[PDB]
Amino acid sequence: DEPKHQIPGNALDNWAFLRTYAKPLPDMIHYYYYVYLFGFFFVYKVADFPEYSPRVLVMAALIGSLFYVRRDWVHREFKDSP
Amino acid sequence: TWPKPINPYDVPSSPAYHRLQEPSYPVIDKDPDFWTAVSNVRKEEWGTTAAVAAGTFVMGYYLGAKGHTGKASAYFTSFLATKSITLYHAYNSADRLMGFKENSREVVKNV
Amino acid sequence: GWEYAGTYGALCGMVYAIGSNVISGRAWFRRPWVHVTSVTLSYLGSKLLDEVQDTYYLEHLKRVERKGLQVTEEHKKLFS
Amino acid sequence: MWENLWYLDILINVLIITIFGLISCSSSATKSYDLKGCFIISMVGGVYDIPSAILWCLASLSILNFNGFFASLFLVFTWISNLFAMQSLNFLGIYLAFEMQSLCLLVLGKITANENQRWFAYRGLLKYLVLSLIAGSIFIFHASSSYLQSGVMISDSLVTYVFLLFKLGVAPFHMYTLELFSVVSRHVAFVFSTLPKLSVLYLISNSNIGSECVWWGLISLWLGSISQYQSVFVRSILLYSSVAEIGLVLLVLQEGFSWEAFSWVSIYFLSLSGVWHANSKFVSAISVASIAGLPPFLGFIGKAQILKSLVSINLGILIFSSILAATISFIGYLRLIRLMYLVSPVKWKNNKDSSFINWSTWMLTVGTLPMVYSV
Amino acid sequence: VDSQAEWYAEYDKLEKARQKRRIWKWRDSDSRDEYAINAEEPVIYIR
Amino acid sequence: MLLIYIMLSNIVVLALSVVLTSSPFMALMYSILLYLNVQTILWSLGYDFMALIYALVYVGALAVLFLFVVMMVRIQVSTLSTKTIQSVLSWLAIILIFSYGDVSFSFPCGAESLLNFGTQLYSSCSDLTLLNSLALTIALFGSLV
Amino acid sequence: SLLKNYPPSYLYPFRHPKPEGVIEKVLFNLGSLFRSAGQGMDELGSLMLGNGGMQESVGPN
Amino acid sequence: SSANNYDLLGQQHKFENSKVFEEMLVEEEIAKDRELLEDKNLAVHQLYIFDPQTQLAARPR
Amino acid sequence: TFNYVIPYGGSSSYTINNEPVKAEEVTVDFSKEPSASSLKLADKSDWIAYTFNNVPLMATVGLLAGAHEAFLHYERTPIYGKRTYNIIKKLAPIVINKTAYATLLGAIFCATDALYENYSGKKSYTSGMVAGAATGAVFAIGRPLPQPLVWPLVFAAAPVIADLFGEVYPESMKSARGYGTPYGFENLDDAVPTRNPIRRNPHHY
Numbered sequence A: 001d002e003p004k005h006q007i008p009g010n011a012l013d014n015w016a017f018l019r020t021y022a023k024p025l026p027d028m029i030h031y032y033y034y035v036y037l038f039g040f041f042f043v044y045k046v047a048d049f050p051e052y053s054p055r056v057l058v059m060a061a062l063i064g065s066l067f068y069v070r071r072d073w074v075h076r077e078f079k080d081s082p
Numbered sequence B: 001t002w003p004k005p006i007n008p009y010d011v012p013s014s015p016a017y018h019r020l021q022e023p024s025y026p027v028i029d030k031d032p033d034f035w036t037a038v039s040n041v042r043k044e045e046w047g048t049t050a051a052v053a054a055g056t057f058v059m060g061y062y063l064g065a066k067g068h069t070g071k072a073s074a075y076f077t078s079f080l081a082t083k084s085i086t087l088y089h090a091y092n093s094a095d096r097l098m099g100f101k102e103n104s105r106e107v108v109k110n111v
Numbered sequence C: 001g002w003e004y005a006g007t008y009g010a011l012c013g014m015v016y017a018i019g020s021n022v023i024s025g026r027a028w029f030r031r032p033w034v035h036v037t038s039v040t041l042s043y044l045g046s047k048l049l050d051e052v053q054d055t056y057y058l059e060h061l062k063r064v065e066r067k068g069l070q071v072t073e074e075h076k077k078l079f080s
Numbered sequence D: 001m002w003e004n005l006w007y008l009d010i011l012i013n014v015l016i017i018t019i020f021g022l023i024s025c026s027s028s029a030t031k032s033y034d035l036k037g038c039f040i041i042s043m044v045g046g047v048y049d050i051p052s053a054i055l056w057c058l059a060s061l062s063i064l065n066f067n068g069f070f071a072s073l074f075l076v077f078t079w080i081s082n083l084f085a086m087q088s089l090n091f092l093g094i095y096l097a098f099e100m101q102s103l104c105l106l107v108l109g110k111i112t113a114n115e116n117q118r119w120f121a122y123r124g125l126l127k128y129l130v131l132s133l134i135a136g137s138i139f140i141f142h143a144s145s146s147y148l149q150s151g152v153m154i155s156d157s158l159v160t161y162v163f164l165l166f167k168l169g170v171a172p173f174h175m176y177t178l179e180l181f182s183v184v185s186r187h188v189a190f191v192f193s194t195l196p197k198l199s200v201l202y203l204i205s206n207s208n209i210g211s212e213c214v215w216w217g218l219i220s221l222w223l224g225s226i227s228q229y230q231s232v233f234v235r236s237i238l239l240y241s242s243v244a245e246i247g248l249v250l251l252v253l254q255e256g257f258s259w260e261a262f263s264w265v266s267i268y269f270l271s272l273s274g275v276w277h278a279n280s281k282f283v284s285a286i287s288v289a290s291i292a293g294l295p296p297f298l299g300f301i302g303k304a305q306i307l308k309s310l311v312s313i314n315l316g317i318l319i320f321s322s323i324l325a326a327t328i329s330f331i332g333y334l335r336l337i338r339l340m341y342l343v344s345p346v347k348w349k350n351n352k353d354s355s356f357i358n359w360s361t362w363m364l365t366v367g368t369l370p371m372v373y374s375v
Numbered sequence E: 001v002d003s004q005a006e007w008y009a010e011y012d013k014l015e016k017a018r019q020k021r022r023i024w025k026w027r028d029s030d031s032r033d034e035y036a037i038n039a040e041e042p043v044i045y046i047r
Numbered sequence F: 001m002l003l004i005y006i007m008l009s010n011i012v013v014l015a016l017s018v019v020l021t022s023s024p025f026m027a028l029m030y031s032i033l034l035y036l037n038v039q040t041i042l043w044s045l046g047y048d049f050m051a052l053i054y055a056l057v058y059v060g061a062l063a064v065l066f067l068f069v070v071m072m073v074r075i076q077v078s079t080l081s082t083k084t085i086q087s088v089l090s091w092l093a094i095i096l097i098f099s100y101g102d103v104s105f106s107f108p109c110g111a112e113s114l115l116n117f118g119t120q121l122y123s124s125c126s127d128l129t130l131l132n133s134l135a136l137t138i139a140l141f142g143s144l145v
Numbered sequence G: 001s002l003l004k005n006y007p008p009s010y011l012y013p014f015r016h017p018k019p020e021g022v023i024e025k026v027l028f029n030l031g032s033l034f035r036s037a038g039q040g041m042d043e044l045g046s047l048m049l050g051n052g053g054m055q056e057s058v059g060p061n
Numbered sequence H: 001s002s003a004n005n006y007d008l009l010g011q012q013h014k015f016e017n018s019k020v021f022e023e024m025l026v027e028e029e030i031a032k033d034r035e036l037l038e039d040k041n042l043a044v045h046q047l048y049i050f051d052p053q054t055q056l057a058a059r060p061r
Numbered sequence I: 001t002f003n004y005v006i007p008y009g010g011s012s013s014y015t016i017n018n019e020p021v022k023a024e025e026v027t028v029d030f031s032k033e034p035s036a037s038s039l040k041l042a043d044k045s046d047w048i049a050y051t052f053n054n055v056p057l058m059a060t061v062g063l064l065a066g067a068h069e070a071f072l073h074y075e076r077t078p079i080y081g082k083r084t085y086n087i088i089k090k091l092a093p094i095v096i097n098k099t100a101y102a103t104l105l106g107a108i109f110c111a112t113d114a115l116y117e118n119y120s121g122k123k124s125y126t127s128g129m130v131a132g133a134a135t136g137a138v139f140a141i142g143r144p145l146p147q148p149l150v151w152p153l154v155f156a157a158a159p160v161i162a163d164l165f166g167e168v169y170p171e172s173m174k175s176a177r178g179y180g181t182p183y184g185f186e187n188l189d190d191a192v193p194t195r196n197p198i199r200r201n202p203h204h205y
């Protein structure tokens, strides 16, 4: 026997939490189609955007990084309800 | 305006590819034929053609033998390589006749 | 260009023969014919590479002179 | 008529080899080495410059590992499309060459899948097709508007830049590569993640197709690096590495550094060959190290050319991003090294078909000192 | 062992390499379309 | 002028019908009617052979291929009708947004000639005709296997 | 079998039939030269290898 | 059961060992071509269907 | 120096100056100058004007994030099953709230930056630090313990990173050329160019 790290939580509760990821999985093509379409239009529009200060650009990148939600996060928490 | 009349039999046409260059050297033949170009190919080029043909015969036989068809591969490879090198040599000789490339030997040999 | 291209190439051919033997689990001395072939081919390839590099160095010197870089005789000496 | 002959020779050569292979089709020679050699000789008739000679080298190396007459013919078709892409002078040449290459990818992917692998391969091919159709349709619609407004078809436009961005697979147009290349054969993924790039880089450099915007390469560099670090599967690590690098290369190529991108593509090809055609742990380790950019291998020279180009343009944000993203990528490559020699006993199939793999590993090790002049 | 000669030879070799590098680093655009920057270059286009 | 306008306006209704219908067989039928309307638009711009080409390649051959595939893969897609009023107006809004205020140019009429088109295709523009033939060969070889 | 045109090399891999072509005859004679030179070199190497010379023979049944 | 099993084993081993060299080589080529022909997208597969035990063309496809 | 007796490096005279010598006889510039739009947006004189000019960027980023999350929710919902609830009513708050929060944070950052620069009267790193700190304070209003310290730091650091590598870096390394003779050392005998290399034409996309 050897010293081991203590695992927070009960075994069945952790397994139940892990089981909330086992949900119908959409195909990634649906997301990709929209991202490709809007991305092409976005690239066309970007050429006409006004020149922004580097500081403003960096701040916008920070805000976007903070506000980005990982696909797994929505997947785990999605509920088909009002 | 008025439509220009067109002669169906003589409609202006041109080849797809054009070399944009004025002849630096004298023009022995403005429009050489295939046979004229072949007749002007240098002896060294013909030696290169024969060396390539022999080498490709040997390589073709070697590769063909692994598939039990050595003779057929050797002849096909020889023919294919000889044809491609000969077309390259004829293109070079035609360019020399047209004056695009150096033609010192060519002008002397056929005045 | 490089004055040690021939030696380097021969040693690299040795590197090829030994490495190929070692990767396949054979000892370095196995397949002696491979060693001579590799050494000769690598030596020739290294030499050829050096001429190619020199040729493109001279082409570049010609181009820069045409553009207007006032290269001196010593600079024209740097590119063999 | 003589200029036309140069182009005509390639067609005559391809047709005669095609009909010879069809006539001489037998079980006795499933691996038509003779035809492979004829195809290689034929592709020497299209070498006109150094980039064409690199296209020939890469196509020949790719042809060596394809099995059967059919696959090699479709690689020759890919080579013809790539050669025509470099020479394209207007919208029609670009569209025609790239869509022919897309067709060759669809066929090569389809004909290298087993019956048990059809469910995932055909899905990935279909997703690639539909995304390609979106890209091509938006390209041709904008090209039509540009042709109407200007009266002429000029390859210096935003429309072509965005299209070639899709073809390179930078910014948000990299998902087709991930979906398709994950489900296809290792050789097909390797040859179509390297060879196509050279043609696009040549087109961009020669036709002045550059933009002032650095967002797309910055995005590709960061997304690729972070996604490489978070990816469990090893195919995704390799696929995202190409996204990150081609993003950085795109940034370098916009600023006029053509020589460095043409040297990078060749080193990247040689580095990727051994990791993708995995047979030996050592070859794969040396490949991963070269992709990573470790100094004893040729991969260091390739990365060095790009980094050296970056310091000349003197853009601070790019340099900072590059350093951090490279570190993140390095963690993924360390993961790959850990998986092979530090996790569990590894047993791989004895696929003893290392055509150019030993040569590539040798060229990676040995090539650093000869090519030191560049950097 | 003439140390002075060796030092001067090594310095000269490094200086020549630096000069050759700087000459090499002078590179105009090689684009086929960019005829203006490369007007003096002798090129033939088959198109 | 009324006929040209009607054809131009109709092409939109015939394109909307394809996406809205829930039956794959019916969508092809609407696409066939769209292709014919495109032939009639081409007739108003002065092209006769080009409009013939569209009908031959698409109506004559491509539609047959689509029907063959649809019959072989036949699925039950009459599950439910989801054409809520909210969805249709949102779609028509997206369409209107995209198709608004673009640069417009006066309608042209241009007489075309096959003699010139054939001459150019087989002389000055021979490079395109052969690359297209190679593309067809690539498709033939890949589809048949 | 369906086909009777199979290459002789395919049908008899262990020993090819007697050479009939000029090229095949030349290859045969070259092979004879290579075999004899190789046996000579083998014997020379066996001398350097010393007592026994790493010789091998068929074993009795 | 042990005796009967070893009798069957003996029969199998006798069968494998008794084949002559020419047959063993031919079988090695059969096995190699079985490995090469595992890919079903080859052009030759479209032409003919091969016999499983000996990879010889059996019928046209 | 590579010795242990004297200090390494060197000393340059402050009294003696070297007259500037042009890199080349004729200078052709392929780098375009800043646009009038860039200068207009960069003008921080009037805080309200500055804020309203620069918020479009934050609004766009918020809209992209909200569209992403809304799509993720929409994709999962099943078309085949009829849903009692209205999907748009569920999805519209996501997008609206994300856009509003992003715009509010960017407004705070731009306002504080302009107000500090006006009050101080000087363009300085501190203005970015105080704008970032205020934005991070607003972000962490109700968050647990570590976040109040971490967000004001990360947000304050971001304008520092932007200033160092977007403004100071290029101006600091403007002189370096790479061709001809090293910037400082023109006495050395290196090939002298008639014209500067033009590696690319001025961009237009």
Ligand SMILES: CCCCCCCCCCCCCCCCCC(=O)OC[C@H](COP(=O)([O-])OCC(O)COP(=O)([O-])OC[C@@H](COC(=O)CCCCCCCCCCCCCCCCC)OC(=O)CCCCCCCCCCCCCCCCC)OC(=O)CCCCCCCCCCCCCCCCC
Binding pocket: A034, A035, A038, A039, A042, A057, A058, A060, A061, A062, A064, A065, A066, A068, A069, A070, A071, A072, D171, D172, D175, D215, D218, D219, D222, D223, D226, D227, D230, D317, I061, I064, I065, I067, I068, I071, I150, I154
């Ligand atoms: C209606 C359709 C719906 C789509 C809506 C719009 C459609 C697209 C239209 C136009 C699209 C073009 C532009 C959109 C963004 C470009 C990305 C893209 O399109 O790729 C395709 C992408 C999917 O591609 P994929 O390959 O399949 O997915 C790969 C991922 O692994 C996906 O797997 P994953 O999601 O599970 O994993 C996510 C992973 C993926 O990683 C990334 O997202 C990498 C991106 C990082 C930065 C990107 C470059 C930034 C440069 C921007 C350039 C402009 C500014 C210029 C100067 C800025 C200098 C940096 O990141 C994370 O783990 C989450 C963290 C988020 C960022 C991580 C960085 C955190 C730093 C903050 C520090 C604070 C922490 C301190 C405390 C920590 C305590 C220790 O599609 C999208 O995501 C589009 C959604 C649009 C939302 C973007 C939000 C803001 C957009 C602009 C802000 C720029 C930052 C980017 C943030 C996130 C972007 C992903």
Ligand SMILES: CCCCCCCCCCCCCCCCCC(=O)OC[C@H](COP(=O)([O-])OCC(O)COP(=O)([O-])OC[C@@H](COC(=O)CCCCCCCCCCCCCCCCC)OC(=O)CCCCCCCCCCCCCCCCC)OC(=O)CCCCCCCCCCCCCCCCC
Binding pocket: C008, C009, C010, C012, C013, C016, C031, C032, C033, C034, C035, C036, C037, C038, C040, C041, C042, C043, C044, C045, C046, C049, D359, D366, D367, D370, G041
């Ligand atoms: C560096 C910086 C980087 C910059 C640029 C880098 C450059 C980039 C590119 C550079 C590339 C370098 C890396 C790639 C290396 C290439 C790969 C490679 O090494 O070979 C692969 C390849 C791999 O062989 P493998 O691993 O056994 O697998 C093949 C299988 O057997 C498969 O079997 P198979 O069915 O395919 O069989 C076909 C093939 C493969 O078959 C074989 O390999 C079986 C073995 C061949 C017979 C043994 C060779 C006989 C003499 C070799 C000398 C060894 C000396 C060592 C011991 C001394 C003995 C006294 O048969 C051949 O050998 C074809 C060649 C014809 C020659 C055969 C011998 C002719 C009689 C001898 C000629 C003259 C005798 C003079 C002196 C004789 C004694 C010294 O090796 C060869 O094919 C050998 C090629 C030639 C054999 C040696 C001929 C040398 C001439 C005799 C020495 C006289 C001095 C030489 C100078 C003058 C020449 C006449």
Ligand SMILES: CCCCCCCCCCCCCCCCCC(=O)OC[C@H](COP(=O)([O-])OCC(O)COP(=O)([O-])OC[C@@H](COC(=O)CCCCCCCCCCCCCCCCC)OC(=O)CCCCCCCCCCCCCCCCC)OC(=O)CCCCCCCCCCCCCCCCC
Binding pocket: B052, B056, B081, B084, B085, B088, C049, C051, C052, C053, C055, C056, D041, D042, D044, D045, D047, D048, D049, D050, D051, D053, D054, D056, D057, D258, D259, D260, D262, D263, D264, D266, D267, D363, D367, D370, D371, E030
């Ligand atoms: C023997 C003499 C060789 C010495 C010099 C070679 C030149 C004469 C060619 C003579 C042939 C020898 C081949 C060597 C070079 C290949 C080049 C070439 O051939 O064309 C160039 C030559 C003229 O082009 P050019 O000299 O490049 O100059 C044009 C402008 O300057 C514009 O072109 P540019 O791009 O060179 O412009 C200058 C460039 C500056 O560019 C350079 O500095 C180039 C640097 C040289 C690097 C060499 C490596 C390239 C890899 C290709 C390997 C060669 C494959 C051979 C393919 C052809 C085989 C014959 O500046 C740039 O910034 C552009 C970027 C260039 C790319 C960046 C360079 C990096 C490359 C990747 C390196 C990365 C390392 C990876 C691994 C390294 C490990 C050590 O074309 C010809 O003379 C006619 C072509 C005829 C070829 C085949 C025709 C004969 C047979 C006809 C029928 C065939 C069918 C029958 C088959 C017969 C056999 C069975």
Ligand SMILES: CCCCCCCCCCCCCCCCCC(=O)O[C@@H](COC(=O)CCCCCCCCCCCCCCC)COP(=O)(O)OCC[N+](C)(C)C
Binding pocket: B054, B057, B058, B061, B062, B063, B065, B070, G009, G016, G017, G018, G019, G020, G023, G024, G025, G026, G027, G028, G030
């Ligand atoms: C040395 C000068 C002359 C050499 C004689 C060759 C001249 C013949 C004309 C060219 C024919 C091809 C040259 C042979 C090279 C490769 C041939 C080959 O593949 O060898 C064997 C098998 O493959 C090998 O063994 C590999 C050998 C590699 C090459 C070794 C030979 C080295 C010298 C030959 C070529 C040198 C130059 C040729 C002339 C320039 C072929 O097998 P099969 O198709 O079954 O033919 C055998 C005939 N029969 C069984 C019926 C008796």
Ligand SMILES: CCCCCCCCCCCCCCCCCC(=O)O[C@@H](COC(=O)CCCCCCCCCCCCCCC)COP(=O)(O)OCC[N+](C)(C)C
Binding pocket: B063, C045, C046, C048, C049, D033, D034, D036, D037, D038, D040, D041, D044, D057, D063, D064, D065, D352, D353, D354, D355, D356, D359
């Ligand atoms: C200055 C050089 C440095 C710059 C680098 C670029 C320039 C390249 C210079 C050298 C190129 C060398 C390329 C090395 C290729 C390695 C050879 C090879 O791949 O052979 C294959 C060939 O495989 C084939 O498919 C053969 C088909 C064609 C054979 C060769 C075609 C020859 C055509 C003519 C080429 C001449 C060039 C034409 C004019 C230039 C054999 O391997 P396998 O049998 O499939 O498996 C090996 C198994 N194991 C190692 C584990 C034992």
Ligand SMILES: CCCCCCCCCCCCCCCCCC(=O)O[C@@H](COC(=O)CCCCCCCCCCCCCCC)COP(=O)(O)OCC[N+](C)(C)C
Binding pocket: B016, B017, B034, D001, D002, D004, D005, D007, D008, D010, D011, D012, F126, F127, F128, F130, F131
């Ligand atoms: C990778 C390329 C893809 C795209 C390639 C596009 C570029 C190739 C386009 C050309 C396709 C082939 C068309 C012929 C090519 C060269 C032209 C030619 O040789 O025809 C001769 C015709 O000249 C001849 O020599 C007649 C005999 C020709 C015999 C065969 C040569 C051409 C063979 C073409 C191969 C097709 C045959 C079947 C394909 C296997 C020149 O035409 P004219 O000069 O106008 O006619 C002669 C009149 N006069 C000389 C008096 C001015």
Ligand SMILES: CCCCCCCCCCCCCCCCCCCC(=O)O[C@H](COC(=O)CCCCCCCCCCCCCC)COP(=O)(O)OCCN
Binding pocket: I120, I122, I124, I125, I126, I127, I153, I154, I156, I157, I160, I164
């Ligand atoms: C990688 C750099 C990122 C900074 C890392 C610091 C640790 C992160 C913690 C977050 C804290 C926010 C960032 C603060 C760092 C700035 C240093 C504060 C010094 C300071 O306040 O002086 C300012 C100038 O310093 C400056 O703004 C310029 C100093 C440059 C920052 C330090 C550069 C080296 C740090 C790298 C250390 C290790 C790297 C690993 C991260 C004012 O100047 P003023 O002109 O306004 O005068 C006033 C007239 N009103």
